Amino acid sequence: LRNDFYRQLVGKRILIVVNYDIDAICASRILQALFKYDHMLYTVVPIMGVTGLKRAYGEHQGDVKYVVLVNCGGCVDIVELLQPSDDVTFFICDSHRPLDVCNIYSDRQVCILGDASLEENIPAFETIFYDSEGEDEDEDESSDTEQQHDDSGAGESDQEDQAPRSRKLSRLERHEQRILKQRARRQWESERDRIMFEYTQFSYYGRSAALMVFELAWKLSKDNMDLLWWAIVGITEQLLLGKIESGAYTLELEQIQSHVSRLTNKTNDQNTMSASKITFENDLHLVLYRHWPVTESMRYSRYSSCQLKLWTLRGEKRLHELLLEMGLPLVHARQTYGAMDLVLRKEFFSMVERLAEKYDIADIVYGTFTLSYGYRSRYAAADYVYALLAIMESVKKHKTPEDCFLEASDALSRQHKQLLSAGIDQAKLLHAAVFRQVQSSLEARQVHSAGSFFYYVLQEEHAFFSYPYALGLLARFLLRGHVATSRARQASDLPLIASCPLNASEGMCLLVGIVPVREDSPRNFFGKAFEQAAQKSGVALLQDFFEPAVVQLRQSDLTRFLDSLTV
Amino acid sequence: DIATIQKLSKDPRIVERVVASMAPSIYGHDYIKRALALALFGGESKNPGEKHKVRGDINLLICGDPGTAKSQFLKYTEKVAPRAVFTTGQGASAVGLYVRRNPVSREWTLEAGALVLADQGVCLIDEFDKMNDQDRTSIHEAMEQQSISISKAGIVTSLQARCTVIAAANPIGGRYDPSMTFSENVNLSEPILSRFDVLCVVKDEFDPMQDQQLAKFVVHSHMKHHEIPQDLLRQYIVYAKENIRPKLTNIDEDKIAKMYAQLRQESFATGSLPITVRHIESVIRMSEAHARMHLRENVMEADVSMAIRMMLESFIEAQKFSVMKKMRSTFQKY
Numbered sequence: 001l002r003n004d005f006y007r008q009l010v011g012k013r014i015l016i017v018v019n020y021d022i023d024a025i026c027a028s029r030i031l032q033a034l035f036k037y038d039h040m041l042y043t044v045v046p047i048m049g050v051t052g053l054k055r056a057y058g059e060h061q062g063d064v065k066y067v068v069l070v071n072c073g074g075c076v077d078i079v080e081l082l083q084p085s086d087d088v089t090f091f092i093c094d095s096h097r098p099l100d101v102c103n104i105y106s107d108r109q110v111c112i113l114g115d116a117s118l119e120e121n122i123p124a125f126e127t128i129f130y131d132s133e134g135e136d137e138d139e140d141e142s143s144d145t146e147q148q149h150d151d152s153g154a155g156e157s158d159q160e161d162q163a164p165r166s167r168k169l170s171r172l173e174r175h176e177q178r179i180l181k182q183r184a185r186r187q188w189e190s191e192r193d194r195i196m197f198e199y200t201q202f203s204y205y206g207r208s209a210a211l212m213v214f215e216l217a218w219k220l221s222k223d224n225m226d227l228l229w230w231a232i233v234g235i236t237e238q239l240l241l242g243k244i245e246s247g248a249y250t251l252e253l254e255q256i257q258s259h260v261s262r263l264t265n266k267t268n269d270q271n272t273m274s275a276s277k278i279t280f281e282n283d284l285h286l287v288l289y290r291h292w293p294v295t296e297s298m299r300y301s302r303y304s305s306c307q308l309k310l311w312t313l314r315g316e317k318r319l320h321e322l323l324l325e326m327g328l329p330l331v332h333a334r335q336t337y338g339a340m341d342l343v344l345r346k347e348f349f350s351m352v353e354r355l356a357e358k359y360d361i362a363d364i365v366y367g368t369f370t371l372s373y374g375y376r377s378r379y380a381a382a383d384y385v386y387a388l389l390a391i392m393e394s395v396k397k398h399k400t401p402e403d404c405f406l407e408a409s410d411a412l413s414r415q416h417k418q419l420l421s422a423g424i425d426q427a428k429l430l431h432a433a434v435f436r437q438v439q440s441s442l443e444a445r446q447v448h449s450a451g452s453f454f455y456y457v458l459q460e461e462h463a464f465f466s467y468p469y470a471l472g473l474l475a476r477f478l479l480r481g482h483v484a485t486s487r488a489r490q491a492s493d494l495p496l497i498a499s500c501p502l503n504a505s506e507g508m509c510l511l512v513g514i515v516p517v518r519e520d521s522p523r524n525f526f527g528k529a530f531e532q533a534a535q536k537s538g539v540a541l542l543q544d545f546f547e548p549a550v551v552q553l554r555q556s557d558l559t560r561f562l563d564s565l566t567v
Numbered sequence: 568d569i570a571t572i573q574k575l576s577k578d579p580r581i582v583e584r585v586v587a588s589m590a591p592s593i594y595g596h597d598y599i600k601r602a603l604a605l606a607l608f609g610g611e612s613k614n615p616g617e618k619h620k621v622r623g624d625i626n627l628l629i630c631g632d633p634g635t636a637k638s639q640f641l642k643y644t645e646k647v648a649p650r651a652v653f654t655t656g657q658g659a660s661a662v663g664l665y666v667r668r669n670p671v672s673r674e675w676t677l678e679a680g681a682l683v684l685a686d687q688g689v690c691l692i693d694e695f696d697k698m699n700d701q702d703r704t705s706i707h708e709a710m711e712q713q714s715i716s717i718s719k720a721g722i723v724t725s726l727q728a729r730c731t732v733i734a735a736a737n738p739i740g741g742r743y744d745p746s747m748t749f750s751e752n753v754n755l756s757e758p759i760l761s762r763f764d765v766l767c768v769v770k771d772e773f774d775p776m777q778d779q780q781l782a783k784f785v786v787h788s789h790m791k792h793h794e795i796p797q798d799l800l801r802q803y804i805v806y807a808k809e810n811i812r813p814k815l816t817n818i819d820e821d822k823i824a825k826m827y828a829q830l831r832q833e834s835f836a837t838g839s840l841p842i843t844v845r846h847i848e849s850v851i852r853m854s855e856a857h858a859r860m861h862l863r864e865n866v867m868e869a870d871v872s873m874a875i876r877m878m879l880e881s882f883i884e885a886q887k888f889s890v891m892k893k894m895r896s897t898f899q900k901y
């Protein structure tokens with residue numbers, strides 16, 4: 001709730017919107033709007049990393065009490081992170097959910113939006129910080145330390161039969177005067193079975209970043225159509241239930257339509273140009289039905305391709321055979337779908353949905369929205385987001401990271417669109433440059449298993465694959481690629497790694513972790529899994545991202561680290 | 568009976584089984600056998616950005632003997648390979664049978680050569696070396712710029728010549744010289760020397776054992792009255808130079824520089840007859856040729872080192888009685 005706490009929000013603030021994300025911008029531009037509405041000046045921020053965050057707060061060494069960060073938080077007992085915080089108001093709203101408890105407790109400078117059907121970690125603080133063994137926060141028999149310290153009367157207090165609290169059992173000795181430590185460790189470790197179940201085996205994401213924010217601003221009587229679209233963007237990023245889960249899809253078909261359909265501000269007069277209120281339809285995650293012909297865009301998506309195996313010829317043969325049953329002309333299969341004639345381009349999906357039921361594909365259609373600004377053309381559900389990811393354009397000017405962020409947030413207006421087509425173009429060329437490596441690497445047989453996983457390494461830098469989003473995308477097209485056709489049915493289920501050269505950064509051999517096949521809810525080990533070898537030998541590793549599934553190494557200090565990381 | 572390919576086509580011994588179907592005619596001469604064998608289907612356009620179109624071309628040459636069987640080597644090429652035309656030495660003045668376009672004379676019939684008439688294929692030459700210098704001029708761009716360009720009519724249009732070239736010439740000096748230098752063996756002008764390729768030669772000296780062996784083979788050849796067939800590999804090479812489109816990757820491409828230096832340092836004014844930056848790139852052509860002989864599309868040290876093997880043999884071939892320069896230089900390489 002903040003139908004009460006929002007009424008705190010008038011004084012000065014800082015609105016930080018942590019490292020690059022589509023949840024980020026969609027969730028934050030609305031609040032920029034909200035906050036120049038009630039006549040507040042504030043601060044939006046680019047985040048380059050947790051160090052970027054810490055210097056940022058360092059540069060804002062004031063007493064801005066209404067500090068705000070969003071889509072982060074699980075890093076420390078962040079009073080340890082952020083010492084000078086005294087009673088300063090922070091707000092966490094992150095869906096990176098497996099977060100510390102010291103950030104949850106200490107009801108001082110934090111917002112426990114603790115609301116979940118998992119009441120599983122209640123004494124998770126009641127024994128690690130509250131108990132201790134072989135400790136110094138205590139007294140001694142001598143008269144020089146005759147003062148009572150922060151006596152928790154627990155293992156946090158002494159273990160020499162000095163514990164006024166801890167009134168479950170005997171006092172002097174259970175079997176010995178220090179069986180205190182024995183039972184302390186019993187509970188400690190027997191329930192580190194569940195502490196190590198947290199944060200040291202697996203990570204995930206939770207819920208939205210900004211649909212809660214839509215309901216917040218909905219209670220103040222705003223029917224901002226565009227805010228529905230921006231939140232739609234925020235979700236349709238990791239609506240990708242194979243990437244990171246939505247789940248609620250068939251429940252949000254009630255939720256969001258109920259937000260928007262039932263309140264019909266015009267039921268009879270809406271046949272107008274500007275922003276004719278949003279609609280909903282059941283369509284695909286075929287990449288880019290609209291502005292391209294079929295036959296290139298039927299070819300660069302993984303799911304349409306992997307099930308029909310087109311990077312070899314034979315897939316094209318069966319492809320043509322299904323265009324045959326579809327009876328699309330090849331010319332028409334090479335003019336833009338919109339550039340087609342009428343009747344075919346109307347009936348296209350109408351036929352494809354039902355007579356693809358019978359030929360190896362079942363999971364291409366979705367439920368989404370689309371709308372006009374005017375009479376130019378009818379933009380698409382995600383063709384923003386696949387234009388966005390192409391704006392992470394790590395050029396060597398050193399300004400372009402933050403500048404491309406600022407550009408991106410200045411994109412989803414109804415105004416700036418000469419760039420949006422730019423994003424489309426950039427996206428397409430990268431999208432088929434993805435495919436351009438798979439044939440090279442598959443049929444060169446670069447699929448290094450090397451034991452319990454599959455593994456890739458690469459050799460030099462591409463501007464595609466300088467940054468790691470494209471890298472995860474590489475790994476997540478090859479994987480299906482190889483494991484369709486080179487295997488029996490036994491070994492299709494193992495995880496994957498991939499090197500990522502950075503000729504820019506003096507030689508670091510970046511990596512990204514990614515998971516085996518077809519287990520949507522059973523997600524990453526790699527919330528910590530890499531860190532094993534970090535303990536065993538341990539060499540210059542990083543975990544800088546609030547994204548977990550990533551590292552950054554030296555050019556060449558990986559292989560032995562990998563041999564340790566065999567297990 | 569169409570996986571005729573892939574019941575067999577992936578074996579390691581198939582480096583040499585292609586040689587057994589060149590021309591089933593000659594006892595010796597593995598070298599030119601292999602050279603034509605690779606160059607019949609090798610090729611790569613690799614058009615970089617707007618610069619030019621590099622080559623679907625090569626000019627292998629054998630300047631042998633006036634009468635060692637050479638003109639017969641050529642015909643099986645045609646009887647297998649997809650395109651051609653037959654032409655012998657003493658062609659036109661290289662103009663060809665420059666028209667102005669009218670409905671007078673009933674259209675004033677039109678063409679410019681035969682590399683205009685057969686591109687990405689072959690069209691044949693025999694016994695060249697005693698032809699009009701005014702043709703050795705003329706053909707001297709199409710080989711490498713692979714481009715034609717004309718004038719001198721009612722038009723100045725242009726047209727594509729992507730081809731390779733037959734060789735088939737004749738030496739001067741009677742039959743063939745000793746190991747004494749090659750520029751002295753046949754006398755072609757300076758700005759033609761530019762390009763050059765697969766340098767082989769039918770140098771002859773007498774072994775009676777070999778005379779016995781081949782002559783048995785000959786009379787056996789004259790005794791047929793009434794591994795590969797020609798039935799198939801035709802289609803292998805259609806497939807190979809049509810569909811698959813190889814590549815290269817950094818494996819050892821620095822070694823090429825040391826060997827080019829081995830030319831320039833061992834060879835300065837003795838033998839090294841302006842062999843510029845075409846034959847070097849022909850190195851790549853051999854390697855890409857080998858991998859398409861394998862349908863590989865990439866490679867390790869193997870194909871490039873095979874190129875180095877063959878070139879190392881040849882450039883020892885065309886020296887002096889001091890014949891072992893790169894030989895001594897490459898026992899460490901070899």
Ligand SMILES: Nc1ncnc2c1ncn2[C@@H]1O[C@H](COP(=O)(O)OP(=O)(O)OP(=O)(O)O)[C@@H](O)[C@H]1O
Binds near residue numbers: 594637736
């Ligand atoms: N291994 C061989 N098998 C069959 N015939 C051979 C062989 N070696 C030499 N010959 C014979 O030698 C003759 C060579 O004459 P050919 O018709 O080849 O003219 P040429 O050698 O090309 O001479 P030029 O090119 O100087 O006119 C051919 O008849 C050929 O049959």
